[PDB]
Amino acid sequence: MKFGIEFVPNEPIEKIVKLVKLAEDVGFEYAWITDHYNNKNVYETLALIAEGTETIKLGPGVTNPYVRSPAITASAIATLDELSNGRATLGIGPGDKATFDALGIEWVKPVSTIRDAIAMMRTLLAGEKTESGAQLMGVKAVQEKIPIYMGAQGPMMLKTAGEISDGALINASNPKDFEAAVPLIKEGAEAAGKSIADIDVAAYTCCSIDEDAAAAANAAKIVVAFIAAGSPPPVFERHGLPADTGKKFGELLGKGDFGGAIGAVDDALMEAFSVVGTPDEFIPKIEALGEMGVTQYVAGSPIGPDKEKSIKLLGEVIASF
Amino acid sequence: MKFGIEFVPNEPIEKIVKLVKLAEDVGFEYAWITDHYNNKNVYETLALIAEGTETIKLGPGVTNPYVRSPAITASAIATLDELSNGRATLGIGPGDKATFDALGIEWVKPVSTIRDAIAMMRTLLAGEKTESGAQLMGVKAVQEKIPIYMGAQGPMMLKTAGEISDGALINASNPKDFEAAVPLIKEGAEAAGKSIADIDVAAYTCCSIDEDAAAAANAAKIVVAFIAAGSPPPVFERHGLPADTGKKFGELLGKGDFGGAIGAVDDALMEAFSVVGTPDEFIPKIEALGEMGVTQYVAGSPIGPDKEKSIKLLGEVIASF
Amino acid sequence: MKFGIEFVPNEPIEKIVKLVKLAEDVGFEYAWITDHYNNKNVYETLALIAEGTETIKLGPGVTNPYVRSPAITASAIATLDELSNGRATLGIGPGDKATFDALGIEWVKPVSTIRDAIAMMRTLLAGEKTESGAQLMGVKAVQEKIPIYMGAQGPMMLKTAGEISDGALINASNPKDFEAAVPLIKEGAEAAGKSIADIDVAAYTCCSIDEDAAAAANAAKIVVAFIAAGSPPPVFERHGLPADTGKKFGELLGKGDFGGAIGAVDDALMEAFSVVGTPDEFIPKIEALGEMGVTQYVAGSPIGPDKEKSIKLLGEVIASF
Amino acid sequence: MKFGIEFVPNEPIEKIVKLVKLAEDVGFEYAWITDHYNNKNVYETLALIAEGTETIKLGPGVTNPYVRSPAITASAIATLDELSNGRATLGIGPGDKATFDALGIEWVKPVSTIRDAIAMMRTLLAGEKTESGAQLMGVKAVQEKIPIYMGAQGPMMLKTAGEISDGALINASNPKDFEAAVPLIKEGAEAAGKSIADIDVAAYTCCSIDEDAAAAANAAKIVVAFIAAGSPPPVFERHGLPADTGKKFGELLGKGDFGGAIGAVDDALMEAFSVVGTPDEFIPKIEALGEMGVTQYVAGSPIGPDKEKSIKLLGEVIASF
Numbered sequence A, B, C, D: 001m002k003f004g005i006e007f008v009p010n011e012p013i014e015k016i017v018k019l020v021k022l023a024e025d026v027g028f029e030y031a032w033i034t035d036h037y038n039n040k041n042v043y044e045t046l047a048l049i050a051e052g053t054e055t056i057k058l059g060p061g062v063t064n065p066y067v068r069s070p071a072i073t074a075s076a077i078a079t080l081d082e083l084s085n086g087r088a089t090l091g092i093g094p095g096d097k098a099t100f101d102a103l104g105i106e107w108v109k110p111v112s113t114i115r116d117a118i119a120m121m122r123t124l125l126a127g128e129k130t131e132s133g134a135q136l137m138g139v140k141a142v143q144e145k146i147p148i149y150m151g152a153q154g155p156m157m158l159k160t161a162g163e164i165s166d167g168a169l170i171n172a173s174n175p176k177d178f179e180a181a182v183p184l185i186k187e188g189a190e191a192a193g194k195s196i197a198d199i200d201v202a203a204y205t206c207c208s209i210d211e212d213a214a215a216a217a218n219a220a221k222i223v224v225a226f227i228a229a230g231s232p233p234p235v236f237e238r239h240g241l242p243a244d245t246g247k248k249f250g251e252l253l254g255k256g257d258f259g260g261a262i263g264a265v266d267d268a269l270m271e272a273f274s275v276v277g278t279p280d281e282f283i284p285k286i287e288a289l290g291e292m293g294v295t296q297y298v299a300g301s302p303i304g305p306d307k308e309k310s311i312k313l314l315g316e317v318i319a320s321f
């Protein structure tokens, strides 16, 4: 089991740099920085992180092919690869409708757009020239092949991730989810003459760890609420939950009733959409994920009540693997 | 007269950082970094430059509204403003069809596209929400109003710059060009109820300074050949140069005959398209630019035979103003 | 040689805007819209064209001092200049007795009227106050000097154009016409202390371009028929055509026998009153006009069998200049 | 009771378009744009407004028969009618001596001049040919009969408005004014075999609405000053005001002492020449106007301290009707 950790560039970058270095120091192998126009620039963040670290792999988790030309993305990743001396990773996903409407961007066929974006980035990152004539000149990747992970939350994306990516960042925290997802990724990989062993199945989980299991659960509630809000009914179906649970949280979060949403979050939901608790509790859960194909466990927001402490606690978990 | 300097991110960023720091040490107030998908990401470069400097203003010179959503650009710029404690600048221009063809981007209505991008960025950078509902959350500009400069090489762009920008980055090095351009910026400024005094007129010059005039001239020739090749007929007429000049250089460069191009660059062309020579020779030329309305002298490529050495020589020049 | 294009606002304004946009895209620098009380309002048309274009100059071609107070004309042009960001032009001619009889307007001293009109508009557009006390208040020109072109089809108008205008819109398509007309403009320019080089001599031609020279010629026949019907004796004399040619076509047209008029149009007439043929044929004819002092070639009605196609063909022609 | 709103084209047209769209969204059914040579062209303004709206009726309020030939006005209205798909209206008045003096136009027989102008325009707008031969050809009205409103501030104009118009735009804000005016309109309509029910009696009021009744009153004072300054003796007598009132303000404004004129405006004047206050206060006032025959309430300048806000407030008032 490999470990990754997520950070949202909504706090001072100098602070994020220190936290990533801490994560590196306790054993995390991957650092994933979210990419959203309303937060700090993901590449300016990653660049400063690269300077403050030495071995952890880092990249956007995930960017998308719409807010920036895939060529600009390839260039930003190659630039990061040079700064980090070969530690860049590239996570890319379809993005979200809310964002694109606010940016006046047409959200046309995400799968094929991602497919085309990756094809172009593969070419550019390889130092090659695309049929259209695009080619990197003043920047060059260090790695022979920078890994490209696809954020995949649906069947077509999962199959596609198997076919063209090196990893899948799946927004899920429970074994049952990967029991359903991995097979799709495998089907895609085989179709491409690849093996499921070639794809790093990353569990992009809602993570909250603390000595106080109660405090841990409380810091994750708001995150789990949005997760539920954004999940299709067949997902609540999979976890033995009410098919309309998501809609419920949708309305609360919609109004802006965060307090009510938090209060609506019970144990059945925490169990379905997050990995929360004490260090000891994380172990069997991560093992269960591993048994379902997860090869990378990503500690996602909120990480814990106190990030610095929680990363230290996660270090204990990593030492157990 | 204020001073700016250009750097192309096609060499190690650590080196660029050292060069901007040096430019800062000798009196430059602005650092302009080029932005092209085929070179290193301009924001990763700018972020590091900010970390390695303390008072110099810095920003892309220039980015464009097509390769990245202007909302991403605003975010990149606000992130830089935070990292730099309010020293960011934002230069933006139309871009070039060649690049966009390679990237599969349609180059629609450049003037209105830039005007719309700027309106959106003004709002986002001000911390406000756009009509479309876009708003910066995890990042906030330090400056109340981050300066936006427009690259303007035509009448419509110059008037627009006077109307909606805080400055115009004009690729011209001779007084006669500004004698013709400033009036248009002034028409725009006045149409917007502003004053020509509210616009920083920046001569984005081809600069080549060296103790050895001949060495300086030689280093700039290839740049002058490209400048001439991309110059519209009115520019030549204005300088008393054959109307065909641009097409001649265009063909010479197009067939890879760089020797011919360089050989065709004479005293007349150097005089019209660059500021080259010894420190003592720079003084009068820059004063002449100031008398035609230029408020910021930008030393652009190649800067000189040796950048580090030339930055120090420009330091002498700056001390003379 | 600069290129202009003429459109009659008797078809959807929406279509006209797109065609002007197309013209702008292929290189035309001027758009001229006719102004007749019986067609769509020229300014509503120009205002929408301004919204749908970016760089092409646009203006009425031509209006007159009788159907609207020159002050109203000044305001309409200044309004257009604001909307177009400094791209307005003002073509104004004496008008014609037919129209003014149908409108109950006394065609009093046309030369003095157009002269006094222009003086008033010059003052108003400059934002100054006339002796009579008129002054623009809620509208202001962007350009420091909006160009005023005079429709000049006779000696006194040509001399006056040279004396007080920035250009002359001459309804002629053959070099012999300008051979005779330019000297008159020159006389006026010199009488005013100006030079013929200060006046844009625009050939307001009957243009019809197409791959098929036969089809091109056929589309212009009806237009030529009318031009002939309205041409004075020295014109037919100049082109070695029967002195009664006008009266002839005048009767065929005055009886709705358009089929007859068209059939009565031969090569000698096509040669004397229009520029028709394939793109290859246009080049020499346009250069021939330029040799006679024409500085702006205006492609006038019908433009071609298919306006859209023809504008594209004229684009090829423009690329040759 | 129907609602109209007035805008003066002395601010960017794009802004006016949005304000009219807002007005349309909150229920206004008519938009009136003033027409003076010293402000932006009314038809270019109306054309862009038509583009940015869908149901509100729009037209000049009011134009006159002196600055443009009635035939030009007819085609301008017909053009607007096509652009808005049958939403054009036509307001016409006699104009003012001071304006025509400045334009060197002979202000003769206003009553018959308007009468003749309307007859001509009804013929042209109907697509028919005048006795003089004038006829629209390249433009055609959409509405079977475009409404023509006469600005009527006196007995003859009111009578005439009843006889030949479809509505009267009366510059008055108090019920007492319409008590005196409507009967004159009725007399004129009956004389023409028409019904007072056929004439839209529009109160072209000085309007100022705001949450703060004081702020509202303050924004309207300067407007009221001019109204009083231009009011005939019978009006002052009607509102128990000094016969000197008019000439007293006329003198102050003539001195350029607007601060004084404003300070001279008391509640008595506000009450006689405007509709100011909070939304709740407008309802009874508009009801009172309705009882006197007013069929359209026009919110004229200043509309309120902040137009956008005030339009929203008027939206509430409209909601009550």
Ligand SMILES: [Cl-]
Pocket (backbone or CB within 6 Å): A041, A043, A076, B041, B043, B068, B076
């Ligand atoms: Cl970026």
Ligand SMILES: [Cl-]
Pocket (backbone or CB within 6 Å): C041, C043, C076, D041, D043, D076
């Ligand atoms: Cl008009």
